[PDB]
């Protein structure tokens, strides 16, 4: 620290970055039409999840 110090750091975010990046990340965790991969798991509950339910038991 002698002859060598530091400074604080803060951030800033406007509404365009907040909604564009927020909706962009939510969409990055969502689907295209948002209805595609729902029935995939709804019907995988009868085929694949049954093994996870038996192992869970």
């Amino acid at each position: 620290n002698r002859h060598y110090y530091s400074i604080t750091i803060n951030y800033r975010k406007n509404e365009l970055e907040q909604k564009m990046l927020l909706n962009l990340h939510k969409k990055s965790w969502m689907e295209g039409l948002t209805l595609q991969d729902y029935s995939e798991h709804c019907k995988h509950n009868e085929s694949v999840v049954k093994e996870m339910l038996e192992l869970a038991k």
Binding site: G32, L33, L35, Q36, S39, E40, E46, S47, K50
Partner: protein
Amino acid sequence: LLKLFTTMELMRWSTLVEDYGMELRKGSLESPATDVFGSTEEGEKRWKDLKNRVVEHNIRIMAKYYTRITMKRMAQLLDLSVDESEAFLSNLVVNKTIFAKVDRLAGIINFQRPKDPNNLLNDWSQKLNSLMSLVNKTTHLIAKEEMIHNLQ
């Protein structure tokens, strides 16, 4: 060859009787037909097992379609006895006919309608139908939405 290629329509072999007869008669091409019939029994095995081979192959083609051809009526259209059709079933038991359904009362056979487990079969069909409608509905919707932009 085109009739034996695929999608064999159920036709009468009497039209092929004169075709094979003239195939033995004409000498311009495929002349050694009498050499095919050289032996007294080999040609008979090739002919009986030939008509048998196509009368089994057409069954293997129509077996893909689930149209329920009602082989009881098919035996009437083919003008043959049901006993050699039971022998044809004796050729199907070695031709892997294990995926079929028979009836004690009637004579109609079923090449489909299994126990149908809903977790595998209806699961698969509902997956391909629903998902295919979802992504196929997804493509031309926004694709046409881009096609209408050029009108401005």
